[PDB]
């Protein structure tokens, strides 16, 4: 089949969609991977032996005054600037005509699109190509949904879609997946957990962060990362910083800077000085796969993005969960329900947190002998499912057979 994949302008979407693209190409299916030029330049290089079977289609974002040149992703357009977020959404909506023009001449058997791509689902109807809507989250997340705005956009894409795609399996969610066959009438297929193929991401294993981990003792480092886009204000960064200090663990912290915050104001006064030997803060893109693979990393303080949840658990790491928005909350609950993680206490009404809640979560998961060994033993039990690569390939084989019918 010639499958056209158009992921949402977010590395949380672009990365797993490129893994999918390559898993399809490995079965000898042609993929057209449709996105913007800079997002594509920033992706892992394709496996050379699959290079002709993953065609990249670079649709330039229309230049919307106010959205600066290169601001093509959620990683580039900050959430703490709502104005720019909307300019990014409008520019993304400007890809409609060029996407329609492309799909016309594509000879496409399927179009797989994200929930934001109402205009791509429209082009699929225009050119009589069956359109699968990606909801590459937990079965629990989809159950939670089932129970122009983004909701209008979701409703509109879903109505024009023949199929809904989830990223889980009965092995990981026996309670949800069996009874979850449709979403507002549209049939749901789960393509497995699709854990990343480590080689696949083509990260730098000589990165300073990984060399730093080599020096640390086994299962001793709390990796801290909130994925690629979720906002965290300077005040909240400070609470997370002081929380990491108070718990007293070795930490590696992949931190994105809030907008308009100097390197001087970003962290608490003397924070790096006081933690020099024990902790490392990186305000750049880190090789997350290499870090989580490392024997020095014990627990993972995550925002519970589904990619990060799956990456964390495939290397048997118990989770310290700080969900910010969207799928994160339900993803946190599901892991908490499986006793392989603990949520940071949150003030009800505002969803805020403090250094004390942060510290108590880290202690319970990573420090206190009895609680930590429970969380580790349970993360390891989940690892048996999440890292069963053969299982998740059989689910990709299953998903292809679904597309043929
Ligand atoms: O410094 C970083 C930040 C993010 N990621 C990757 O970006 C993806 C983020 O996806 P997730 O759903 O976990 O969070 P999102 O960015 O979608 O909120 C994951 O695959 C991470 O491994 C990374 O490799 N290094």
Residue numbers in the entry: 15 to 161, 202 to 459
What text does the study give?
Here, we report the biochemical and structural characterization of OsUGT91C1, a glycosyltransferase from Oryza sativa, which is efficient at catalyzing β (1–2) glucosylation. OsUGT91C1 is able to catalyze the addition of both glucose 2-1-R1 and glucose 2-1-R2 with roughly equal efficiency. It also catalyzes a third reaction, β (1–6) glucose addition, to create previously uncharacterized compounds. The enzyme’s ability to bind steviol glycoside substrate in three modes underlies its flexibility to catalyze β (1–2) glucosylation in two distinct orientations as well as β (1–6) glucosylation.
